[model samples]
Each structure stands twice: as C-alpha cells, then as structure tokens.
Target: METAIITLSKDGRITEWNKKAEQLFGLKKENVLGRRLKDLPDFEEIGSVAESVFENKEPVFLNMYKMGERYFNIRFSPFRNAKTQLLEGVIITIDD
Candidate 1:
C-alpha cells in the first residue's frame, strides 16, 4: 500500500502522519506532528490551498507537488465536529 494517510488540524497543522507518510515524505511522525503542513518546507508553497479546506469545508485534490526526487498528489478533506457541526480539521492523503 503506497497510500500515505495524514490528518491535520483546521489551521493546517499536522495531527496524524502514518508510517506510509514517513516513506512518502521522508519524514517521521516526530518531525511532523503538531506543525502546520504549509509550514513544512515542501508543502509551504501550496500549503495555503491545503488550508482552504477549512473555509469551504470541502475536499481539495491536486497532483504534482514535488519534494526532492518525488512528485506527490494530495487529497485534503475537511473534518467537522459532529456535535457542533463546525469545522474541526482536515485529512490529507499522499499517494504514490
């Protein structure tokens, strides 16, 4: 399975990064968690777009985000609070 599952906060900070994400991004959960995805050097360029999921509460999909030798395609999905029905965070997946 080459799919890398990543979950983020509404503000775009890293919340969960799976083992596949380690291989895909060449990063560890320790290096990524609690930090903003856009704040990360590679995603910084298009990070704002990723964060936009919060505003519209919609999923954003795109391809060709490069980091070193690889190109990444991503899916950003909005997470909402089930109780309050308010934006909570997002889930992003990196694919091979």
Candidate 2:
C-alpha cells in the first residue's frame, strides 16, 4: 500500500511505521520504531493530534495544508482490537 501509516503506543512511542511512512517522514523503521514521539521536531503539533485521539478515542481528519509548494492531509484514529474496543495506541495516516 502506498498509504503512509504509523502507530504509536499510549506513551507516544512509535510502534509501527509503514514503508510509505518511512519515505514521507524521512525516518527508517529501525530509527523510529520504539522511539518516543516527543523526540521529533514537530512533536508539539503531532503531540496535540495524538492527545486528541487518545483523549476522545475517535478518529480525527485534517485536510491538506500548504507547506512551501506541497500539501498533505493527516488522519488520526484510535487503534482498535478485533472486539472493536480501543487499544492502547493510535494510528496516523498521511496523504498528499
């Protein structure tokens, strides 16, 4: 899948990073997996997104935004188990 997808634990530690995520974020799985989200440069903004998903236990969608000449959309959703219950993590999807 070309979709950029990632997951972070309740403590904001990266749990998974798809191939597209690696390319988009310039982070390799080995470098980001298990690392805390707060360590990233855009942690303040990303952290707030994470907090919203964690606190509300729901999905949040953001439209494309301009950055230089590029634009991107961000989707944040609570990770859920087979039983349809919320998990201890969140999934973030990025797209252009």
Candidate 3:
C-alpha cells in the first residue's frame, strides 16, 4: 500500500518525516521538518483544517483530498497526554 505519515508539533510544525511521507510529498525532511503545513505546495488549507482539529481536540477521519489527478484519503489523529489527556499535536496519515 502507498501511504504517507506526518506528525506535527502543537505549533503545527512538522516533527516526524518518514520515508513514505518523503516519497509521497516529494519534499525533503530538511525542507519541511520545522515548517508549517501551509508552507508545503498545494497544502495551504491543511494548516487551517489542522488548526481546528487541534483547537477542538477532535479526531477527523476519512477526509478526501485531491492533488492533480490523484486522490487521497486522510485522517487527522489527535495525540494527547496520557495522564492529563491534553491535546499535544496531531498525527496525519494519508493514503492514495
């Protein structure tokens, strides 16, 4: 399966850059690791949507996104503190 994974900090800057994410997004880790999602090509809306997920502390599932001729399905998973259960950031998974 072709999949991409990206994890962000509370500030919405990328924290984890995996091989699948690198291959799928066509961006280097060095370029995006500390950058906001809006900085990435064609992903300006992601930052806003992701921000809401954080603000609401909710989990979003089965969202569809299209890039060029390819379509992707994404899920935004909120990562929270185990003890306090406070939202920390989000783990976004994309599949095409």
Candidate 4:
C-alpha cells in the first residue's frame, strides 16, 4: 500500500504522478507533471536510471536503496507500444 507509481514520456517528461507518488515525494502532480525528473532536486539519480531503462528496453530493479532517511525498493520498467513493440516511456514503481 506504500507503493508509489510514476510514468514518464520517452522524452523524459513526467506524464503521470499518482497519489502515492505525491505522498512519498511530497510533490503534487499539478506542480510536476510535464517536467523533466532530472531537473528536480532528489530525482536526478532516478532520472538516469529511467534513461537506462529506455535505452536497454528492460527493467531495472533496485533493492534496499536509500534516499534521504528512507529506504526503498525501486523498479524502472519500460513501457512499449502494443503493436509496434517499441518503447514509449518508462514506468517507475517505488516501495518504501
């Protein structure tokens, strides 16, 4: 129930920032949607990983990763077009 989900466009602009993401990061979707993750503080690292996911077209799992005072398990999954099987974005899930 503590999981946070976020989605980014292929160009790295935030597309979805869910309620759990707001609770976890203290960032509201209204303020962050359509912005680049790396331009925000505390998010540059995850941004890089998301880029990697896009480039590799694979999922990347981070177990027991720490940010600030919290420890989380993070996953970056590439989202692809159904018919084309081409990557369209990245889906990121964070569990604390």
Model 1, runs deviating above 4 Å? 64-69
- TM-scores of the candidates in the order shown: 0.81, 0.82, 0.86, 0.94
Number of the predicted model whose TM-score against the real structure is largest = 4
Q: Pick the candidate with the highest lDDT.
A: 4
- lDDT (tens digit, per residue) of candidate 2 on 1-96: 237888888778889889998787777989878988768776557767887788888888887644336677878888767786647888888888
Candidate 4 runs further than 4 Å off: none
Note the Cα lDDT for every prediction shown: 0.78, 0.78, 0.81, 0.91
Q: Which stretches of model 2 miss by more than 4 angstroms? A: 66-69, 83-86
Give lDDT for model 1: 0.78
In candidate 1, which residue pairs get closer than 3 Å at backbone N, Cα or C atoms, i.e. clash? none
In model 2, how many backbone clashes occur? 0
Instruction: List the candidates ranked by TM-score, beginning with the highest.
Output: 4, 3, 2, 1
Superposed on all Cα atoms, the candidates' RMSDs to the truth, in angstroms, are 2.0, 2.4, 1.6, 1.0
User: Over 4 Å off in model 3, which ranges?
Assistant: none
Model 1 residue 42 lDDT score = 63
The backbone clash count of each candidate, in order, is 0, 0, 0, 0
